[PDB]
């Protein structure tokens, strides 16, 4: 409703770096807000793409940003009659970023890994890896839970069970309020998908450079399955956290599986032990139900509600014809111990191939009326196909069916305006929560400042 579309702020990165693929707000120890931006194709040391991270200080006029430096050199360790190898070429550092407290977590989902022993090997595969930083102190750490030292022959002899060689850990990420990092790894267990969790404090205290294979005892990984419904499910394509079991001491996980059960798609809610509390099935095959998940109480009853995006949903139209426009589902959490029922509201895109629901960002209370609001991106929507972001306001009965405001992309065609979103933080300290929007196709980020209601 009250975001300012006239005076925008623009941040820019190098051409071709995909600056803006991911982003988040960051507060330093003093509360000063800044923006952390990932650029998955930033050039590295050997003039080859490795990805990179930028930490942009807030400035009305925007501009260029300084780098948040990480080690980009391939590593090798000869130990235990084996050879450990990391490969950072095209690892996509900054494909996801998230901030908690005064720490930044940036992931490289496609970092490759291998282990040699005489003539045998584990196989060169994308286990993924996460880089952690405390910018003010300079502390650095890494976390790569899918690394292993088992030889290829052993996996074959055991029927490829508990095979975490293609996890792509860091594909999606999120941190609990208590400081527990949760990683989505849609390629885990031979493409079923898994989740990896460990306290940030324990990631730092147990990490040392040059080791490559170390233990984080307080970590916990999800489990393999023999149920074909989960095969090629990409469980962990997206992740989020929230409170869905009435017990405030426990934190529940929300996980997207966009191709679950033969591309039907699903979203599951779990406890911290990966036991399933609820499952939400997709409505239409190949719609990618679960591509994105967002948790937030929109109807102001103190109970977290769930939003699911299905960017490839095809709406029915005149003459038995289907039109790919995308759809978003709203599930309100009921009182007491009960299961989430049918969705309370269905929002459906209008522009063909617009991919409405590719991203969903909680905005907090934009217009300050007492109800939390959300933003939905359609990165190829709008009458010109340049991309659009739609704002929906919360209400006692859930969400308004019509958007209160629409943001047309200020960038050229193909910028992917809205592919990444993040709100609910007041960056200029004017009392109103603001929205940042990534456009990796243009290598830029746009900041929309909220203003008093007109």
């Amino acid at each position: 409703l009250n975001l300012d579309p006239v005076q925008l702020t623009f941040y820019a990165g190098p051409n071709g770096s995909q600056f803006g693929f991911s982003l988040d707000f960051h507060k330093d120890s003093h509360g000063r807000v800044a923006i952390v931006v990932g650029a998955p194709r930033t050039l590295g040391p050997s003039q080859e793409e490795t990805g990179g991270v930028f930490l942009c200080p807030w400035r009305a006029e925007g501009g260029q940003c300084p780098s948040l430096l990480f080690d980009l050199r391939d590593e090798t360790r000869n130990v235990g009659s084996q050879t450990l190898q990391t490969f950072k070429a095209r690892q996509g550092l900054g494909a996801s970023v998230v901030s908690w407290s005064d720490v930044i977590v940036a992931c490289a989902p496609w970092q490759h890994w291998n282990v040699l022993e005489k003539t045998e090997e584990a196989e060169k595969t994308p286990v993924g890896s996460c880089f952690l930083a405390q910018p003010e102190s300079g502390r650095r750490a890494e976390y790569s839970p899918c690394r292993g030292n088992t030889l290829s022959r052993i996996y074959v002899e055991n029927d490829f069970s508990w095979d975490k060689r293609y996890c792509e850990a860091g594909f999606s990420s999120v941190v609990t309020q208590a400081g527990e990092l949760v990683l989505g790894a849609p390629g885990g267990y031979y493409f079923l998908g898994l989740l990896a969790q460990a306290p940030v404090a324990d990631i730092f205290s147990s990490y040392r450079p040059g080791i490559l294979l170390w233990h984080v005892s307080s970590q916990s990984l999800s489990f393999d399955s023999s149920n074909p419904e989960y095969f090629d499910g990409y469980w962990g394509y997206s992740v989020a956290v929230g409170e869905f079991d009435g017990d405030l001491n426990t934190t529940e996980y929300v996980v997207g599986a966009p191709t679950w059960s033969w591309t039907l798609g699903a979203v599951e809610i779990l406890d911290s032990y990966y036991q399933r509390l609820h499952r939400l099935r997709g409505e239409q095959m190949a719609s990618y139900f679960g591509h994105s998940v967002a948790v937030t109480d929109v109807n102001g009853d103190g109970r977290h509600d769930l939003l699911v995006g299905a960017p490839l949903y095809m709406e029915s139209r005149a003459d038995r014809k289907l039109a790919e426009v995308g759809r978003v589902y709203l599930f309100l959490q009921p009182r007491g111990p009960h299961a989430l029922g049918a969705p309370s509201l269905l929002l459906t895109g209008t522009q063909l191939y617009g991919r409405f629901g590719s991203a969903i960002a909680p905005l907090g209370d934009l217009d300050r009326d007492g109800y939390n609001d959300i933003a939905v991106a359609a990165p190829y929507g709008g009458p010109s196909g340049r991309g659009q972001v739609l704002v929906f306001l919360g209400q006692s009965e859930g969400l308004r069916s019509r958007p209160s405001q629409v943001l047309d992309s200020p960038f050229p065609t193909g910028s992917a305006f809205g592919f990444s979103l993040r709100g609910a933080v007041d960056i200029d300290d004017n009392g109103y929560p603001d929205l940042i929007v990534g456009a990796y196709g243009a290598n830029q980020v746009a900041v929309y400042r909220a203003q008093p209601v007109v």
Partner: antibody
Amino acid sequence: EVQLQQSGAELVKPGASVKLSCTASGFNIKDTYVHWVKQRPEQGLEWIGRIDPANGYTKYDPKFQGKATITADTSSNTAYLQLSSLTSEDTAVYYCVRPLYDYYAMDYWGQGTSVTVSS
Amino acid sequence: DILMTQSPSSMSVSLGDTVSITCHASQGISSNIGWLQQKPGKSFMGLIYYGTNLVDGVPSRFSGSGSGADYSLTISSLDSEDFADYYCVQYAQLPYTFGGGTKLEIKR
């Protein structure tokens, strides 16, 4: 806290066998590698082998091949070292060992189990 | 099998002194070495891993150094509890192998 409680001192005759144990305390035995080391006053420390309780795969120093057998039962969170055809040279103190962070290190140690062979 | 030559076999020193134990492998082990402590009539305790990294709980007066096939364990300002046996161990190659050991004795 991580602690390794080994079994009590054993006392057996030559030619017989014995099975020592190493129970994990404060953690899951399946977390890391588990090693067995032999200590003697004159000879010193010698590495016997390791086991990965998760799957059961083992490695041995060829010197102890046939004499030593390492196993583990995740159900009881315990690792075992079985010795056979016991002789006087087998008289030593045996320790169970696991790493702290580094996969290949040797940081935590059990209190040690004493074995004595005599007729 | 890699041989770990540890020296000296023993040394007589006093409290507050700074002493250094050395270990020499028969070949390069690239910091894949650990240092151990065994107090008289007791089990072992980990001191160092991967050459220079202190095991949790170990005082900072202990420190490891070296590279290639030569490494060192140093105790700055000896404490009354530090008088014990020390052993080095390499895990660059299986089977793991230990050093001869070093006994720190009280001087008088």
